[PDB]
């Protein structure tokens, strides 16, 4: 059991379609989105921030990153 | 169970009546109707034998289903 596991399973209580990292089959040492979300929430809790605020800011940062890679892929398609 | 005949088609109505006989469980109860008395001591033996043949049929269906599902998946 990992300390971040409840937060990883709380990320499973959301949008399930996130990444093709599991059948990518390139390496077993890069974390996926849910594990890094849970680690972010865990280290925020270890800082002393509130719990719900930790999930809110971690989800907002993830959504910002996903929109930024969406617009980056849009730039790739505009160059393509 | 009553079935209407439409456009003089006897075979279609008879097929529908047979299907409603079977799916309502009434055919199973009619087939299970006895002509002589069966003691409880013989009902126990009959239930034991029926459970044994059900176990064997379930095992056979499981083996056929495992073979067919493993073959159809292309492995």
């Amino acid at each position: 059991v990992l300390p971040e596991d409840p937060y990883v399973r709380r990320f499973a209580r959301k949008h399930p379609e996130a990444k093709l990292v599991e059948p990518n089959k390139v390496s077993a040492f890069i974390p996926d989105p849910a594990r890094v979300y849970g680690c972010r929430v865990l280290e925020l809790t270890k800082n002393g921030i509130s719990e719900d605020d930790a999930m809110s800011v971690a989800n907002m940062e993830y959504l910002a990153e996903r929109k930024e890679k969406k617009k980056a892929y849009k730039r790739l398609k505009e160059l393509a | 169970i009553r079935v209407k005949v439409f456009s003089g088609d006897l075979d279609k109505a008879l097929t529908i009546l047979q299907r409603k006989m079977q799916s309502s469980g009434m055919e199973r109860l009619i087939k299970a109707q006895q002509t002589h008395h069966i003691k409880n001591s013989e009902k126990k033996v009959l239930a034991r034998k029926n459970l044994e043949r059900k176990i064997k049929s379930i095992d056979f269906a499981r083996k056929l289903q495992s073979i067919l599902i493993k073959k159809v998946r292309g492995l």
Binding site: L2, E22, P23, K25, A28, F29, I30, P31, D32, R35 | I69, K70, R73, L75
Partner: peptide, 28 residues
Amino acid sequence: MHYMGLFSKAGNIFRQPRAMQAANAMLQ
């Protein structure tokens, strides 16, 4: 168990192989 404990504080080393996920999809 020191090394397994260190490497469990990482990404996902507990990812099921393709054959196990295939059989789990087969059983359901």
